[PDB]
Amino acid sequence: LSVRTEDFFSKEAISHARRVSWAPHTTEKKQGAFAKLARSNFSFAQEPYFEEEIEAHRKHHRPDVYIYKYNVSPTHFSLR
Amino acid sequence: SLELQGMKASVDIGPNRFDLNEKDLSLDEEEQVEKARLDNELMRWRRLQRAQG
Amino acid sequence: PTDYGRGGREFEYLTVKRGKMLQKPLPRVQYVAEGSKPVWLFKSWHTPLSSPSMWEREVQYAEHTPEHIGAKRPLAVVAPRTMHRYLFLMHMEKVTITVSPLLFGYGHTIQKAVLDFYRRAISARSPFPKDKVFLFYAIDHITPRIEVTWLDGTSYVPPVLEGASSQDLIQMVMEEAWLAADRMAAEGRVLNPLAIDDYKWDQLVVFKKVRDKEAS
Amino acid sequence: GFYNAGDNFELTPQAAYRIYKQNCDETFWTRLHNEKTIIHLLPLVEQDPGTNMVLVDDIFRHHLKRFGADHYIYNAVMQAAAFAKDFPRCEQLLAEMRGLGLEPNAQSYVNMMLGARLTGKPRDQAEAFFREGIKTGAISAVMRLDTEFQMWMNQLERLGSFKAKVGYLSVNEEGASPMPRDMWALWGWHRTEAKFISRKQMISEQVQNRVRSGKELVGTVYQKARRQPWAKYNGMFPYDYNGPARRPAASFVDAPTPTHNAEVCGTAY
Amino acid sequence: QSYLNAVVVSNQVLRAADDVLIALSIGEMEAVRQTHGNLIDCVAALDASLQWPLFTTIQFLVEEGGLPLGPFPRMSRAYYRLKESTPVVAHSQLVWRTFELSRRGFLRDIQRQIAEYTTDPPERIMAGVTGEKGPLRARVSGARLGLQRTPARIPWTMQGL
Amino acid sequence: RTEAPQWRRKLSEKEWDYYVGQYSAQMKQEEDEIQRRVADRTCVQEQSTREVQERWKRHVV
C-alpha cells in the first residue's frame, strides 16, 4: 500500500487482564505518565500462576452463606 | 523544672511519631513481585549451595 | 479444557484442519437490563493511577448502582494491590483501640499486635495522627479490639485473631479504608486526596538510607 | 463412606447420623459437629421428611441440651425445614432466633429465601426477606437491591434441589469407589500441594488452622507470587523411584461375619 | 388411663422444672445443664406419648419461660391448635374477668447462660468472621468427622509452622 | 475359595456398630492429638473448656 504512522509506531504488548482499559487515551504504557510528569525518558516466571481475582467489595466482605455442602455466594460457588 | 528539662522531647514542627523504620515503607505490586522473585531465587540458591556442600 | 494443544517444542504456530468453521456466539453480559442507557467513564493516563476513578468500571449501568447506600455510580471492581506497611488515616474520622494490661501480663501475641498497630497509627501519615487516634485501657479487662469510624459515620472492626501481625492488621485496615473511600466517593462527597507532605519526606529519608545500604 | 466422582471422600447420611449417635457425649463433639451431621442428613430430609425430620429434631434437642441455642444449629435446622418444604417451620425458627436474641444471620435469610423458592411462595416474600436482611446488615449488596436479589435467585435456581429436575443438587450420580482413581491428584500448583496428605501432615494443617487463624484474613500479591512453584525442587526421591513405603493396611480381623452380602447397598443421597 | 398417664408425665415435667429452678437459684452450671437435659427429655417423652394437663404444662413452659418449639414441631402444632380452639379463649376470658374483679423467660435465660458457659473465648472471638478466601478454615473444618475426609487447603508457603 | 465381603454390601446392625466404632476410634485419636498439640502451642488457657467437656462426659456416663 503505502507508508503510515501505524507502521511507524508500535503499541505495547500487554495482555487483556493486565490492561486497565482499551481506551485510546489508555492505549499507552503506564510508565508514560511518570515520564511525562518528570519530563524525562527511561518477564513472566517459569511457572506464572495466579489465583483468580475477585471484586474488591465482594472479596473483602464474603458472606458466610452455605448450602447443603457448597458455599453459595451471589457470584461464586465453592466446596466445603 | 522537670518540664523544662523534658521540653526537648516533643518535635516543635511535626507531630511526635513513635517510630519510622524501613519496615514501614509501602510496596506496590511491582515491588512485591520483585521481592517474591528474590525470595524464591534465594531459596533456590540456598538449595544449590547445600547440594554442592 | 478444549483449548489445550501440543507440547512445548511442538507448539502449534500454524494449524490447518478441514471442516465447516463454526462461529460460536460471543458471551453476552449478564445482570444488565434491556434498553438501559449506561454511563461511560473515559479512562486516561492523565488521571493519576492511584485515583479510584481508574479502578472504577468504564461502562456503568443504572442497575449496577447501589441506591440504598447513597451511591450514585456503581462501585469499583478492581482495587489497588499495594501492601500497606504504614497507615493512612486521612479518610477515617476516628480510631479507638481497647487493650488490657492484665492480658499483657498474661503475655498473648494479640496484645503485641494491637500495641504495634496503635504505635503505627500514632505514627501514621495523616497530620497530627494523635488527633484521630485514641487509646482506651480495658475498663473491664475485655478482649482487645480496634474500631475505625469513617467520615461517613460507618464503622469497621478488624477481626483480631491469633497469628495476626501489625502488618496484617494495617493491611486489612487500609484495604477497608480504600473501600470506604470508594463508597463515599460513589455517594458523592468530596474526599481530600493525599499528596506528598512531611511524612512523605520522612519516608524518603529512610528510602534513601535503604538504597544506600543496598548499594554498599 | 466413599470417594465421589471428584475423588472427594464423603460419608453416607446414615453413617453420619450413626457417628453422631455414638459420639453425642464425647468430649471432642461440638456444635459444629452437630450442624455438620444435620448437613449430611439434609438429602434424606428432602427425600423423605416424614422419617428424617425426627432425626433432625433429635439432633436439635441434643444440641440444645449440650450447647444451648446457637446460630449454627438454628440455621441448619431451618435449612433442613426448607428442604423438607416447611415454610411455617422456617418462619417459626426465625421467630425463635429473634426471641432468644440470636441476631438473624445472612445464612438464616438465605435459608428463608431457599425455603420460599422451594415451597413456591411468590417472589415478593423472598424479596421481603432479602430487604429485611440488607436493612439489618446481615447481607451487604454492592449492586442495586433488585440486581442483588436477581443474582441470589439465579444462584439458588442453579443449585436447585434434590428432587428437582435441573440443578446441581439434582445430580445423584457419583463415581463411588473405595480409593481415589489418582492418589497424586493436586489441589494447588505443585505436588507439595497435593490433595491427599498423610495423617500427621493433616494434623499439622489442622493445628495451623486453629492457631495461625489470623493469616486467613489477609492476602497479598507478595504471597501470591511467593506461592509460584518455579523454584520448589521439582526433582525426584527414592520413594518416587521405588514406590510408596510398604505400610501395612488396617485389617479388620475382628469384624463380624458379613451378612446380607448378596444384598447391595442402595445410594443414600 | 390416658388421663392418668398425662397427669404422671405432667408431674414429671413439673418436678424437672422445679429442679431447674433450684439449680438456677444455687448457681451451679453442672446442675443447671443436668436439669435442663432432664426437662428436654421429659418434653421429648411428651411428644412421643402424644404421637389438657399437658397443654397447661406447655402453656407454663412457653409463657412463664421461653421454650423454643423448633425441636418439637408437632408439639407446636398442637399448642397452636389448642390456642385457636374456643375453650382456651373462654378460659382466658374468665381469667381476665377474675383479674379485673381483683383489681419470666427463665428458660431463655438459662439457655443463654449454658451457651455462654459452654462457648470458649477462642470460639467466641472466631465466631462471625470471614476471610478473603471464604469462611475461616477453622470454622469450616471444625467438625472434622475424619481427617480422611478433611480436605487440604494449606499453601506450601505457609505449610511450615 | 471363600465368599468375599462385597464392598457395596448392606450392613447389619452389628456390622454398622463395629464400623462406626472403628471410625469413632480414629476420630478420637485424631481429636486427642490435635487437642494436645494445640494445648502445647498454648494459644490460651483452655483448661476451663477441657473441664467443662470432662464434666459433661462424666455426668452423662
Q: Interface partners of D (3+ CB pairs, < 8 Å)?
A: A, B, C, E, F
Element (H, E) at F14: helix F13-41
Q: Is D177 left (phi over 0), alpha (psi -120 to 50) or beta?
A: beta
Residues of D in contact with E156 (CB under 8 A): 188, 190, 192-193, 227, 229, 232
Q: Which residues pair with C98 in a beta bridge?
A: C136, C145
Determine whether the interchain pair E121/F23 forms a contact, defined as Cβ–Cβ distance below 8 Å. Answer: no
Question: For residue E85, which of E58, E55, E61 has the smallest C-alpha distance?
Answer: E55
CB pair distance less than 8 Å for D217 and C168: yes
Query: Do chain B and F touch: 3 or more Cβ pairs under 8 angstroms?
Result: no
Q: Do C163 and D212 touch (CB under 8 A)?
A: yes
Task: Say what angle helices D87-100 and E106-118 make with each other, to 10 degrees.
Answer: 80
In this complex, is the C-beta atom of C31 within 8 Å of any C-beta atom belonging to chain D? yes
Neighbours of chain F (3+ CB pairs under 8 A): D, E
* Euclidean distance between CA atoms E4 and C94, whole angstroms: 67
- Interface check for D233 against chain B (CB to CB < 8 A): the answer is yes
Torsions phi, psi of C97, nearest 5?
Answer: -120, 120
Task: For an interface test with A, give the residue of C45, C50, C75, C171 to mutate (most A CBs within 10 A).
Answer: C45
Closest Cβ–Cβ partner in C43, C77, C178 for A55: C77
**F48 touches F56 (CB < 8 A):** no
CA-CA distances (angstroms) from residue E61 to C116, D67, E65, E107, E110?
A: 52, 20, 5, 8, 13
Is the minimum CB–CB distance between E158 and chain C shorter than 8 Å?
no
Whole-number Å distance between alpha carbons of E55 and E37? 21
Indicate if the alpha-carbon torsion angle D101, D105, D109, D111 is positive or negative: negative
DSSP SS3 for E94: helix
- The minimal CB distance from B47 to the residues D222, D230, D233 is found for D233
Calculate the alpha carbon distances from C193 to C51, C84, C185, D203, D240 in Å.
8, 17, 11, 48, 58
Q: Residue F54 is placed in which grid cell?
A: 470432662
Give partners of B (≥3 CB pairs < 8 A): C, D
Q: How far is E140 from chain C (nearest CA, A)?
A: 16
Looking at residue D134, its amino acid is: I
The three cell numbers of residue C82 are 499495594
Residue E150 to residue D227: CA distance in whole angstroms: 22
CB E43 within 8 A of CB E49: no
Resolution value, angstrom units:
3.5
A28 with C45: Cβ contact below 8 A: yes
Q: At what angle do helices C109-122 and C166-187 cross, to 10 degrees?
A: 50
Backbone angles phi, psi at D186, to 5 degrees: -105, 145
Q: Indicate the helix (H) or strand (E) that contains C59.
A: strand C59-60
Q: Which residues contact D260 (CB under 8 A, 6 or more apart)?
A: F9, F10, F11, F12
Contact between C124 and C174 under an 8 Å Cβ cutoff? The reply is no
Q: What experiment produced this structure?
A: cryo-EM
Q: Do chains E and C touch (3 or more CB pairs under 8 A)?
A: yes
Q: Identify which of D225, D231, D233 has the shortest CB distance to residue B33.
A: D225
